[PDB]
Write a protein that binds this ligand. Structure first.
Ligand code: NAG
Ligand code: NAG
Ligand code: NAG
Ligand code: NAG
Ligand code: NAG
Ligand code: ZN
Ligand code: ZN
Ligand code: ZN
Ligand code: ZN
Ligand code: ZN
Ligand code: ZN
Ligand code: ZN
Ligand code: ZN
Length: 161
């Protein structure tokens, strides 16, 4: 139940509510592969998150970090540069991994959301980024919150129709 509620001295400047998990395939011994799913729980930290161009950063243990960009007035703010980094030297989640160190998968998505609204999509957005399947859902989002108060006006993703 990921919640990132960033505030300044005038109120909330960024609100994010969502759920995500990552299905990762990595190489294992004797020329094999292992596929695992990591559900990001809450216990995970949001260090580095900030309200130019407000970002969210999520860390979970040794293994996985995740980040996203919000850039204002690319018409009128873009959700961009979604990046997942995972560390296969962590036996805790990647047991039997051949490769060591960090791997990074980039998401080409560049999504558009109006200002002064809250973006809502409780539905599952799936991005197939081999070797990683990213799933996002239960999303309530507003970057660049004005007057310290989250908007009451909703923009709903098409998947919710
Ligand atoms: C976010 O935090 C502020 C201050 O901590 C609080 O007033 C508000 O209810 C929280 N939730 C939002 C803005 O959705
Ligand atoms: C990952 O998310 C999808 C979509 O919400 C869900 O169907 C699946 O059960 C989740 N996997 C785990 C291990 O929680
Ligand atoms: C699967 O394993 C092969 C070798 O068996 C390796 O070359 C390949 O990179 C692995 N793929 C993934 C997604 O782990
Ligand atoms: C996207 O975020 C990265 C850091 O994660 C930052 O360096 C970059 O400037 C951001 N994108 C834009 C268009 O500013
Ligand atoms: C990856 O994990 C291993 C073991 O947990 C650790 O030695 C290494 O420093 C980690 N790398 C990063 C960039 O966190
Ligand atoms: Zn849930
Ligand atoms: Zn809510
Ligand atoms: Zn905090
Ligand atoms: Zn670990
Ligand atoms: Zn890799
Ligand atoms: Zn590539
Ligand atoms: Zn009205
Ligand atoms: Zn449906």
């Amino acid at each position: 139940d990921l919640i990132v509620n960033l505030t300044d001295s005038k109120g909330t400047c960024l609100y994010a509510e969502w759920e995500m998990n990552f299905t990762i395939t990595y190489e294992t011994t004797n020329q094999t592969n292992k596929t695992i799913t990591i559900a990001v729980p809450d216990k995970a930290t949001h260090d580095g998150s900030s309200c130019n161009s407000a970002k969210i950063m999520i860390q979970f243990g040794f293994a996985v970090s995740w980040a996203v960009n919000f850039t204002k007035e690319a018409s009128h703010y873009s959700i961009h540069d979604i990046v997942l980094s995972y560390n296969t030297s962590d036996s805790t989640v990647f047991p039997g991994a051949v490769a060591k160190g960090v791997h990074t998968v980039k998401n080409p998505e560049n999504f558009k959301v109006p200002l002064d609204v809250i973006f809502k999509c409780n539905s599952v957005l799936t991005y197939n980024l081999t070797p990683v399947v990213q799933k996002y859902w239960g999303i309530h989002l507003q970057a660049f919150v004005q007057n310290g108060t989250v908007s009451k006006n909703e923009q709903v993703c098409e998947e919710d129709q």
